[PDB]
Amino acid sequence: GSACQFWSCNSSCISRGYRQGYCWGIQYKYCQCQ
Numbered sequence: 001g002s003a004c005q006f007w008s009c010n011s012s013c014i015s016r017g018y019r020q021g022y023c024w025g026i027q028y029k030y031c032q033c034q
Contacts, residue, residue, distance in 0.1 A: 004028065 004023030013021025013033030021033045 004031075009033075 006022035009021040009023055009031035011021070012031055013019075016033065018033040021031050023031060
């Protein structure tokens with residue numbers, strides 16, 4: 001079970017206007033998009 005499952009970031013990026021989203025490899029308070 002990941003510390004950040006990409007689907008939650010993915011839906012959070014697409015709702016802003018992107019097509020993809022995920023967390024970084026180590027340290028994060030916010031997602032990465034496209």
